[PDB]
Amino acid sequence: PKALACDGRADCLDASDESACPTRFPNGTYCPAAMFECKNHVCIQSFWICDGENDCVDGSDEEIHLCFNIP
């Protein structure tokens, strides 16, 4: 469904629906501040970081250089 495109979330199996649409804010930002964002422009609740699952399809959450600083 078209309405699910560019809502912040992975809906295409390869998250293509987020991958090719504008920034969300004037300061050049793709996601609300209270969340974690991935290089394909999907963004997710913070606790998904390094939980063991590639939650945004680019897998930026599971790149360990993030949670080297998270207990």
Partner: protein, 70 residues
């Protein structure tokens, strides 16, 4: 329904400019801290939000439901 971009109301009071940022999809209640839950979770005596905004006293003070439930 309030604060979701979809102008459900004709006069436009449904969507003010002082509206907080919406995290949840259309149809989902938004907790004050930004969490989401199904509408039936409101005032159900079970803390369904992290901070329990669905269980705030003011939200339940004059709660009502349809003719088929007691």
């Amino acid at each position: 329904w309030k604060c979701d971009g979809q102008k459900d109301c004709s006069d436009g009071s449904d969507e003010p400019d002082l509206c907080p940022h919406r995290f949840c999809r259309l149809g989902q209640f938004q907790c004050r801290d930004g969490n989401c839950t199904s509408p039936q979770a409101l005032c159900n005596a079970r803390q369904d939000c992290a901070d329990g905004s669905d269980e705030d006293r003011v939200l339940c003070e004059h709660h009502r439901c349809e003719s088929n439930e007691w």
